[PDB]
Amino acid sequence: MGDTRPRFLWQLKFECHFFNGTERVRLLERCIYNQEESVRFDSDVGEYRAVTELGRPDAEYWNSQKDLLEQRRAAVDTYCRHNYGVGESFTVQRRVEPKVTVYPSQHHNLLVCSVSGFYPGSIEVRWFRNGQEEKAGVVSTGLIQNGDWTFQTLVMLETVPRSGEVYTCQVEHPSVTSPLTVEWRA
Amino acid sequence: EEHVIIQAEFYLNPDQSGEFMFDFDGDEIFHVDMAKKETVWRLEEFGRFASFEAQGALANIAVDKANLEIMTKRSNYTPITNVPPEVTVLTNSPVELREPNVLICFIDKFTPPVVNVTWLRNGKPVTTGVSETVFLPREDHLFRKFHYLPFLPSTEDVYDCRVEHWGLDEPLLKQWEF
């Protein structure tokens, strides 16, 4: 690739954590040099705290600035809660229905239920055989974040299809008021 | 834990590269194009329901740059340790011959935030309609990145995402084909 001169990385992170809407909020400010977090401000603690010796000079210094300290303590409101409200309609409430397709991966076949383009992540996918839910023989990839505010998942069912059997993939997601289902006939 | 919003910025030397962005539960809300001193929404509709004054980011970066120098001396010039990326290629949906789909190249857990990604179709690099994200934050403090390639599924095409990063000795290529 070229240019192997050594590198120096500095990262700053202000994390706003929410529990039950804005009922409980926790601000977390982190400073990272290369890959090591050095100093942080945790709203639940109130002041700065060194994480490693490199951050101490800073935790002490910043902690000696009572003004700054108070601003950070109230940022839990002026910053977090504020920002939460700013984009709630298009983040917390963003809703996109998943597209559901079912296809066979040979006697002991594998039925694949693909669920894609959905949001938010919370979802449920179940497999049924003649209306009766199958739990064993089911494996899953879990949530796959596509990086475009969309998720996808593959829930696969291992089974020896018998002629006349009816397999169903059922999906429950915040975007639909009633469960989606796609069927495969053996 | 129901939601998390992260304001994440960084400065890297000797590259003189800086980044400023906000992400929601792992997705990018927007970032600030440093050269255009402009706010860029991950999804355009976002820019109709909210705004961010891009200048504030430029001021934050300047302080980040200065602090990077401070930390660089304080540590006795300890350079970062390269961590090569994990690469995986997938389609954003199930592929169906001659029906619009999208090849996704996910470059995960690496640092520093500098990388080279190239889409190869039958050995040759493509660029028509390709997009990519900026460097997304990870709690372990490494990065993730997405690159996209809209394509028409065909049984006679072979694609490759080609990745280069200081942590690797040679180009890492992830193949994908129908």
Binding site: L12, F14, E29, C31, P57, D58, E60, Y61, W62, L68, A75, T78, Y79, H82, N83, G85, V86, G87 | Q7, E9, F22, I29, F30, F49, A50, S51, F52, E53, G56, A57, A59, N60, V63, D64, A66, N67, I70, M71
Partner: peptide
Amino acid sequence: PKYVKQNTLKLAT
């Protein structure tokens, strides 16, 4: 609506 960022602080020198 307007997003409000936290300000970067100068480290000890």
